[PDB]
Amino acid sequence: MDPLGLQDFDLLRVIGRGSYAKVLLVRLKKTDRIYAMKVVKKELVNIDWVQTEKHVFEQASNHPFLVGLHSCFQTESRLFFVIEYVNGGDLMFHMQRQRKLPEEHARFYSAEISLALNYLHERGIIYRDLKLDNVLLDSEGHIKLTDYGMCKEGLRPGDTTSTFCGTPNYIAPEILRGEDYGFSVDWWALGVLMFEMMAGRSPFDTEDYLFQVILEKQIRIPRSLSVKAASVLKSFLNKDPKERLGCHPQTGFADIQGHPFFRNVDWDMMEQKQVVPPFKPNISGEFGLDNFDSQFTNEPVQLTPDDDDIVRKIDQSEFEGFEYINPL
Ligand SMILES: Nc1ncnc2c1ncn2[C@@H]1O[C@H](COP(=O)(O)OP(=O)(O)OP(=O)(O)O)[C@@H](O)[C@H]1O
């Protein structure tokens, strides 16, 4: 009946690695439930990467299309975030096989993404890293936004922020112009993503040049796309934030829903997960491990032994209060 620690988990598999986290599939023994667990060595964060992740995960959790936080704990060397295991692959891989999605399919995904982004936004958070490989699919085919490492988390009314970041292909013109910006940059990114889903290529097709393309060149809509598909791509991919779909100060989200491209969507049904996804993820392997790279799943299921020369220099006071258990 004590607060959670490593001791309470079976390590099942290594499933992922990013710049910060080693990501493992784990099982909470006493409940037999499985989770992903992000393992971040303290030597990486000895700054407030930590608080932002923790808050975003929290502010999220229990929303249908965002990866939620089960619990956080620490050891002497590491932080651990225990989170929902999402095992249906990701839009990236999915675009590779499909090459190009039907407009109906892209509508479904962009609806679920839109709901997720709006929800984030109404809690003062700019996602800032929407891209195909940050849209996971759960086992049933519903999306979940992942990777909150880029998020900004404290935007009150209009209020703005300033940091140049994001993934090159998805970076809004505001940011590229070095403007102050709000939520607008997420809707731009959704435009790029939707274009990718329906056209099967980036709308931008040297990183210095890419930024020149984004800023100064007209976007070519592929001729085979419906009028509604063209309209919505043109609206989200407006270079002017003020004029961009979803970006109007008070009715942003309302406009998105009211856009003809979306006329078929029952938003309340979508938000409740009562729309049947257009695609059912294949779940092969134990716990669907086959949807993860084998370079990860073939790793030994362990944490790398600590190194005292490093571990002794960690200021442990920096992580007081890290511990968390969700309140559901
Ligand atoms: N909730 C999850 N369920 C299943 N797999 C996940 C989950 N979160 C992350 N992964 C796997 O782990 C990989 C690395 O996670 P992520 O990209 O979030 O790492 P990070 O180090 O936190 O972020 P960054 O690399 O952006 O700094 C993901 O691409 C994904 O394959």
From Swiss-Prot:
Disulfide bonds listed in the record: none
Subcellular locations according to the entry: Cytoplasm; Membrane; Endosome; Nucleus
Q: Name one GO cellular component term.
A: cell leading edge
This protein's UniProt keywords: Acetylation, ATP-binding, Cytoplasm, Endosome, Kinase, Membrane, Metal-binding, Nucleotide-binding, Nucleus, Phosphoprotein, Proto-oncogene, Serine/threonine-protein kinase, Transferase, Tumor suppressor, Zinc, Zinc-finger
Q: Which residues form the Protein kinase domain?
A: 9-262
Q: Which organism is it from?
A: Homo sapiens
Q: What is known of its domains?
A: The PB1 domain mediates interaction with SQSTM1.
Q: What is this protein called?
A: Protein kinase C iota type
- Name of the coding gene: PRKCI
**Means of activity regulation:** Atypical PKCs (PRKCI and PRKCZ) exhibit an elevated basal enzymatic activity (that may be due to the interaction with SMG1 or SQSTM1) and are not regulated by diacylglycerol, phosphatidylserine, phorbol esters or calcium ions. Two specific sites, Thr-163 (activation loop of the kinase domain) and Thr-304 (turn motif), need to be phosphorylated for its full activation. Might also be a target for novel lipid activators that are elevated during nutrient-stimulated insulin secretion.
Q: In the record, what lineage is assigned to the organism producing the protein?
A: Eukaryota, Metazoa, Chordata, Craniata, Vertebrata
TM stretches of this protein: none
